[PDB]
mmCIF file with all atom_site columns, N, CA and C in Angstrom:
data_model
loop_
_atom_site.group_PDB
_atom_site.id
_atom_site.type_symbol
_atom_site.label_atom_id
_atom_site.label_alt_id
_atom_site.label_comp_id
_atom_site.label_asym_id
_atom_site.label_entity_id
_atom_site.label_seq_id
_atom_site.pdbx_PDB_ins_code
_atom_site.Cartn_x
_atom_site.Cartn_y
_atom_site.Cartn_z
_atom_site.occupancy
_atom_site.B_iso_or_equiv
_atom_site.pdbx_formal_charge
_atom_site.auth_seq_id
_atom_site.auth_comp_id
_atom_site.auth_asym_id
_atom_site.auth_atom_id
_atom_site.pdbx_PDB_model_num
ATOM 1   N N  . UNK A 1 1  ? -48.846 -14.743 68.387 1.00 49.39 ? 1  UNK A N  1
ATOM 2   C CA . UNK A 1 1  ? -49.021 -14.997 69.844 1.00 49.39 ? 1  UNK A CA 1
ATOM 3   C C  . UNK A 1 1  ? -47.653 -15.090 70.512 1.00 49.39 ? 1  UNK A C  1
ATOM 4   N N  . UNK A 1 2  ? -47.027 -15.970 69.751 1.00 46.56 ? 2  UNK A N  1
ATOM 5   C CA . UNK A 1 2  ? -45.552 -16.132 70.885 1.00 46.56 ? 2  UNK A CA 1
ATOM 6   C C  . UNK A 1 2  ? -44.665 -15.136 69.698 1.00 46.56 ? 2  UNK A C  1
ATOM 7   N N  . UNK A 1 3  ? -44.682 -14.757 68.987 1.00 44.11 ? 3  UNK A N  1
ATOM 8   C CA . UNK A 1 3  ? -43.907 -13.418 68.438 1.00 44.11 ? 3  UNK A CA 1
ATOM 9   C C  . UNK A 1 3  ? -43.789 -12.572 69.360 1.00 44.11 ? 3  UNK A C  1
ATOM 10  N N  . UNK A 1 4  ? -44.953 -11.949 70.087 1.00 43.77 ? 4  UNK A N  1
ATOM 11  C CA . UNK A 1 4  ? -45.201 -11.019 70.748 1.00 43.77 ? 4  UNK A CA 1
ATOM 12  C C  . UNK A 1 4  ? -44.289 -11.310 71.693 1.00 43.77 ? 4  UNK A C  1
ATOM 13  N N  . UNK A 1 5  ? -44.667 -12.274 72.471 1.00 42.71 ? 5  UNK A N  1
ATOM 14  C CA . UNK A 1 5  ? -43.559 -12.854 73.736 1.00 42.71 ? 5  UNK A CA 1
ATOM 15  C C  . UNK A 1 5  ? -42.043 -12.909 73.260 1.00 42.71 ? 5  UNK A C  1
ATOM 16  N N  . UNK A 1 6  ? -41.038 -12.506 73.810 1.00 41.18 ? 6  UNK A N  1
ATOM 17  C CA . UNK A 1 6  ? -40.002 -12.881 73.227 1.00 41.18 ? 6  UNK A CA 1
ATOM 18  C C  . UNK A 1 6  ? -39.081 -13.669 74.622 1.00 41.18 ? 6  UNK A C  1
ATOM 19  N N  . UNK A 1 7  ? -38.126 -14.652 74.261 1.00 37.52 ? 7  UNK A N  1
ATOM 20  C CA . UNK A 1 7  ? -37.179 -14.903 75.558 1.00 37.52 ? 7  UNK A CA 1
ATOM 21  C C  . UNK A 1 7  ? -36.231 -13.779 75.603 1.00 37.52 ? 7  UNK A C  1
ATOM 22  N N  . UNK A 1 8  ? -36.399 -13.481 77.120 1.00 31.61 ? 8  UNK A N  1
ATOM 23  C CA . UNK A 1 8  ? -34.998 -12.394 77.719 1.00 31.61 ? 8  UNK A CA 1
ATOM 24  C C  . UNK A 1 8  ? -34.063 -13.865 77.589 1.00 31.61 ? 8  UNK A C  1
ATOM 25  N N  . UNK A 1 9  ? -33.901 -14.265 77.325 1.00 28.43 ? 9  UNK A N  1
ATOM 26  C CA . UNK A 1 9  ? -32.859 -15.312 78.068 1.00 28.43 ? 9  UNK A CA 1
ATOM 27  C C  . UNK A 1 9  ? -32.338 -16.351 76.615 1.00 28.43 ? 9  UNK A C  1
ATOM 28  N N  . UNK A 1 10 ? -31.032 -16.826 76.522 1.00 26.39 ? 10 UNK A N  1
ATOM 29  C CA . UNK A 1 10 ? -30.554 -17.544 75.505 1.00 26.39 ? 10 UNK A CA 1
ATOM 30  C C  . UNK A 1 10 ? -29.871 -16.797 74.034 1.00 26.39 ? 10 UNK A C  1
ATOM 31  N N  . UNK A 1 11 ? -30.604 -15.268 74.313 1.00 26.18 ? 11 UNK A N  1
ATOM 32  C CA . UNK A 1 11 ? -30.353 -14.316 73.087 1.00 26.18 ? 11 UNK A CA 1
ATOM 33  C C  . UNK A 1 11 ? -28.872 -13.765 73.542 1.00 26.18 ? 11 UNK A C  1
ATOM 34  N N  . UNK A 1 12 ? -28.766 -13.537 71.834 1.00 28.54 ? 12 UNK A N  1
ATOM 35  C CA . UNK A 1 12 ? -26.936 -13.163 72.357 1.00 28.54 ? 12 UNK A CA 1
ATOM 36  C C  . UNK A 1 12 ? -26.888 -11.477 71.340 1.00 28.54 ? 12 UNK A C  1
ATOM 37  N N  . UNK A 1 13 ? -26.099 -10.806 71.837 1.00 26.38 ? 13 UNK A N  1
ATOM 38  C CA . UNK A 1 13 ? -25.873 -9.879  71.433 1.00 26.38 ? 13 UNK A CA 1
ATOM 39  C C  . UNK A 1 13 ? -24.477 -9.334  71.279 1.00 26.38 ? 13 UNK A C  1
ATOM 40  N N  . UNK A 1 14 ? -24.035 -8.166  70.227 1.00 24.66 ? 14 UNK A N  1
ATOM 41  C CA . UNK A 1 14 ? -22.556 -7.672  70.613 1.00 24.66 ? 14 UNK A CA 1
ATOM 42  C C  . UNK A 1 14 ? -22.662 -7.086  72.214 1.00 24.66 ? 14 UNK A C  1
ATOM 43  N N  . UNK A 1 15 ? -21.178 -7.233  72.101 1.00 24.09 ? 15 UNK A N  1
ATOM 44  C CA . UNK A 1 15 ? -20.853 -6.455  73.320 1.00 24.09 ? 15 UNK A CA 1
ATOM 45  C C  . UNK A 1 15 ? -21.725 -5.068  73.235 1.00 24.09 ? 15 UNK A C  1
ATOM 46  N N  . UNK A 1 16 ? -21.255 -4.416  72.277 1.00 24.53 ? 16 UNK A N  1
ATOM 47  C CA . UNK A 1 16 ? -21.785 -3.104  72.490 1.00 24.53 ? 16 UNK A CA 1
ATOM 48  C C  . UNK A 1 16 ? -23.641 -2.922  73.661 1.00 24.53 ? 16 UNK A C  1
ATOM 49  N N  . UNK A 1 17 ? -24.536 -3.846  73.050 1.00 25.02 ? 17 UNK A N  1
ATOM 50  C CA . UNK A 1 17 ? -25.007 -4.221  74.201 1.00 25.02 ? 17 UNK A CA 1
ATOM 51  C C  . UNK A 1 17 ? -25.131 -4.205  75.620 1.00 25.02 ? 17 UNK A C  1
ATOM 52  N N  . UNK A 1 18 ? -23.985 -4.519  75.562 1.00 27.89 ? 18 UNK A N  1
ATOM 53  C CA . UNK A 1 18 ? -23.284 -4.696  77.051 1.00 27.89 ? 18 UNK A CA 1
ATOM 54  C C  . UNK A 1 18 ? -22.756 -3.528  77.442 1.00 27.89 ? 18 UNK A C  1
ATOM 55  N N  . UNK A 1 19 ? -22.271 -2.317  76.438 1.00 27.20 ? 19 UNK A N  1
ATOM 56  C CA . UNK A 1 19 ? -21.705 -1.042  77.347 1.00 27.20 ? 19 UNK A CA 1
ATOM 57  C C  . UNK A 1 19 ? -23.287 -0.067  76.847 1.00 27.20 ? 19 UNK A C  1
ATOM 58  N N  . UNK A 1 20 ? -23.553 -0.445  75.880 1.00 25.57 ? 20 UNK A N  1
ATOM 59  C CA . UNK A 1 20 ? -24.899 0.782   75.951 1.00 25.57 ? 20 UNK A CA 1
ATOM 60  C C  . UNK A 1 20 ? -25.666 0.548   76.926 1.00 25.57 ? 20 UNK A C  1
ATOM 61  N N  . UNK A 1 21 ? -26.114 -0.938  77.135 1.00 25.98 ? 21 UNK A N  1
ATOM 62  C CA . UNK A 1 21 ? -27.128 -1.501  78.112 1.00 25.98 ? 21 UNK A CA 1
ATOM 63  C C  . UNK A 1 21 ? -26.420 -1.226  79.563 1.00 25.98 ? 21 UNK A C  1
ATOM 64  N N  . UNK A 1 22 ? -25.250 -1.469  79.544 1.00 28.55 ? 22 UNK A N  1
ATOM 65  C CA . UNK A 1 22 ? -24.157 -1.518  80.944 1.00 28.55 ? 22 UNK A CA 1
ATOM 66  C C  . UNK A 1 22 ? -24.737 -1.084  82.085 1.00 28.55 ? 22 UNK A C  1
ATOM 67  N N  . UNK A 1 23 ? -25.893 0.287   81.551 1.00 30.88 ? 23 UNK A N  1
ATOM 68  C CA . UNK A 1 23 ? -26.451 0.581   83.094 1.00 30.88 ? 23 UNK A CA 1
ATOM 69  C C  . UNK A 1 23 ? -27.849 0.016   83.040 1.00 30.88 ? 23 UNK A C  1
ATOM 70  N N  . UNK A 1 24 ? -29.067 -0.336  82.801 1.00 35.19 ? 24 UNK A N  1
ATOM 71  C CA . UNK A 1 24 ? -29.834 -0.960  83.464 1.00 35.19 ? 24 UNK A CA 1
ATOM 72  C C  . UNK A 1 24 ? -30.962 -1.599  81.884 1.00 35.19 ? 24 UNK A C  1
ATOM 73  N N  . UNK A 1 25 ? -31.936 -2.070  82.499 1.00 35.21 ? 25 UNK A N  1
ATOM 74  C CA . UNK A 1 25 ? -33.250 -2.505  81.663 1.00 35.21 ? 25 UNK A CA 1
ATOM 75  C C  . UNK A 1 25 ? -34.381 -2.042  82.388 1.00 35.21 ? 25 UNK A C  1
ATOM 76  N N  . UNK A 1 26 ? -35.396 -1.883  81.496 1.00 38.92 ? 26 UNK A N  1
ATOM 77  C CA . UNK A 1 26 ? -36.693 -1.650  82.042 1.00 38.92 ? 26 UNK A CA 1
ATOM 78  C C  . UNK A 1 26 ? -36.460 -0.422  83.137 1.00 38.92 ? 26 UNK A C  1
ATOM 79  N N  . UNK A 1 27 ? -37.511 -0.315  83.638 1.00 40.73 ? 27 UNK A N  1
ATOM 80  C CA . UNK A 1 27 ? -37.762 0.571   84.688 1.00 40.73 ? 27 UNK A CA 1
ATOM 81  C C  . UNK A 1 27 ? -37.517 -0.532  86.507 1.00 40.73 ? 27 UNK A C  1
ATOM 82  N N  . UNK A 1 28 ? -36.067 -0.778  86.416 1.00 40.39 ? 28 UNK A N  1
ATOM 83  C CA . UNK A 1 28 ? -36.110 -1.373  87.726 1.00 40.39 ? 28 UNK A CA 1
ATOM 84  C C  . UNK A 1 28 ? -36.648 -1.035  89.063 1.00 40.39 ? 28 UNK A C  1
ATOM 85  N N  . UNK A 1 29 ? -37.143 0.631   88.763 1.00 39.87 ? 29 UNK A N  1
ATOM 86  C CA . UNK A 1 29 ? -37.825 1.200   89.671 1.00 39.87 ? 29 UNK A CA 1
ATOM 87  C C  . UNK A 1 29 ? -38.941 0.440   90.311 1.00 39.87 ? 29 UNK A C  1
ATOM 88  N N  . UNK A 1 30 ? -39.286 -0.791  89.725 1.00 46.73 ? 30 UNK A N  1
ATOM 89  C CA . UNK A 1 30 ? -40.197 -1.062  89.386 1.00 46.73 ? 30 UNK A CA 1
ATOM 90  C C  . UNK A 1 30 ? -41.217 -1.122  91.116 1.00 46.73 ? 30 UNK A C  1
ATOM 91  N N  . UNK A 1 31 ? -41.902 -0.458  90.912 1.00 44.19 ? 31 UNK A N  1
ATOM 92  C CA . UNK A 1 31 ? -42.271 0.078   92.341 1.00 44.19 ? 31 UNK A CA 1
ATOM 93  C C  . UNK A 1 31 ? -43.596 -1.007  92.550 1.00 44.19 ? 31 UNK A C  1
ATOM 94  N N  . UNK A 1 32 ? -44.706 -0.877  91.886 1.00 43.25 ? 32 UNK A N  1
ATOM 95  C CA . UNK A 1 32 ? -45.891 -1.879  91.994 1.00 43.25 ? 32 UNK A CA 1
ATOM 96  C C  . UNK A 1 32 ? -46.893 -1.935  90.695 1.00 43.25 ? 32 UNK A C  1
ATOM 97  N N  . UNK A 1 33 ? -46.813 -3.024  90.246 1.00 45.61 ? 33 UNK A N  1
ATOM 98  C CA . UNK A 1 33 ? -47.588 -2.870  88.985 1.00 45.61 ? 33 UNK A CA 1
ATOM 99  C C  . UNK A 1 33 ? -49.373 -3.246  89.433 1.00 45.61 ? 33 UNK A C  1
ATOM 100 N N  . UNK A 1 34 ? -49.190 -4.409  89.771 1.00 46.05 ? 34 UNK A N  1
ATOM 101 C CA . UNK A 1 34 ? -50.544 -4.854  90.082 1.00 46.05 ? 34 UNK A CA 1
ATOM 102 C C  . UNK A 1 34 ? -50.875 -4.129  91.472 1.00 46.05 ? 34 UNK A C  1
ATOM 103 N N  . UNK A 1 35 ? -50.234 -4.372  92.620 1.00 43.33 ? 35 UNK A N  1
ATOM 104 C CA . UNK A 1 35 ? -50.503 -4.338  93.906 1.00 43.33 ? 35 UNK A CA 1
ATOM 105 C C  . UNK A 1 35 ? -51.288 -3.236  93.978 1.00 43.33 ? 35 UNK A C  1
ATOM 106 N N  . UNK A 1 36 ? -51.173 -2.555  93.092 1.00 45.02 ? 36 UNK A N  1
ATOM 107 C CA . UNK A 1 36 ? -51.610 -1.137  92.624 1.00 45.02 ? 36 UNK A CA 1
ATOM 108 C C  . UNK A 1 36 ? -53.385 -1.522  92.630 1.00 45.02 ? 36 UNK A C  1
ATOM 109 N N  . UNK A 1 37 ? -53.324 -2.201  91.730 1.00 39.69 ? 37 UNK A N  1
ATOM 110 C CA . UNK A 1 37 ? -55.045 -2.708  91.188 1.00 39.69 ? 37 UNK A CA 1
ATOM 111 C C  . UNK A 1 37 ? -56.121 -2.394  92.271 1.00 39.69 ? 37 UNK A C  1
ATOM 112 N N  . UNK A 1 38 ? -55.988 -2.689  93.601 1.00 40.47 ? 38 UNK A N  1
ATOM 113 C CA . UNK A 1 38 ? -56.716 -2.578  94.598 1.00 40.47 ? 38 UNK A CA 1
ATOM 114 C C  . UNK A 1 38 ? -56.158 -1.311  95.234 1.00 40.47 ? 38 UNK A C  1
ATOM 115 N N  . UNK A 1 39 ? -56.972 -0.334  94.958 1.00 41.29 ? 39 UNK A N  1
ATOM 116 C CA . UNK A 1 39 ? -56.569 1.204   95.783 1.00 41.29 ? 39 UNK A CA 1
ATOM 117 C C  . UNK A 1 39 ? -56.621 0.857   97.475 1.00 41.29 ? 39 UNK A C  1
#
């Protein structure tokens, strides 16, 4: 149950991280997930 869940937050990583990741996470596009639900 909480495996599945993980914290974004408190986790540490190499740098490298930091220049592979450097440009974004997820789909910040993030346009409408739910709002969607109701056409």
């Amino acid at each position: 149950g909480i495996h599945k869940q993980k914290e974004k937050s408190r986790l540490q990583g190499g740098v490298l991280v930091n220049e592979i990741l450097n440009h974004m996470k997820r789909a910040t596009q993030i346009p409408s997930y739910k709002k969607l639900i109701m056409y």
